[PDB]
Amino acid sequence: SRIVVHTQTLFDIVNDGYRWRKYGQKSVKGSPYPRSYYRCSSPGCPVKKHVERSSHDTKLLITTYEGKHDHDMPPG
């Protein structure tokens, strides 16, 4: 499934309570920075997300999630 989250932050990683493994990057029209692609780190979990800084309001990080976690937020 798909859900978008916006975060007002000057940093480029958002702690969303889950753990992620980056696997690639693509260029983003209108932004200095790439879009980063991640999969959830939990074994067997189908969730993926990508993250890019906004060119409309550069205070924002735009995260797009796909899939539903088959597990709880990991410990730690």
Annotated binding site for Zn(2+): 40, 45, 69, 71
Query: Of residues 20, 36, 37, 40, which one binds Zn ion by CB under 5 A?
Result: 40
Nearer to Zn ion, 42 or 54 (CB): 42
Query: Of residues 16, 19, 31, 45, which one binds Zn ion by CB under 5 A?
Result: 45
Annotated binding residues: 40, 45, 69, 71
| CA dist., res. 6 & res. 52, Å (int) | 10
SS3 content of the chain, % helix, strand, coil (to 5): 0, 45, 55
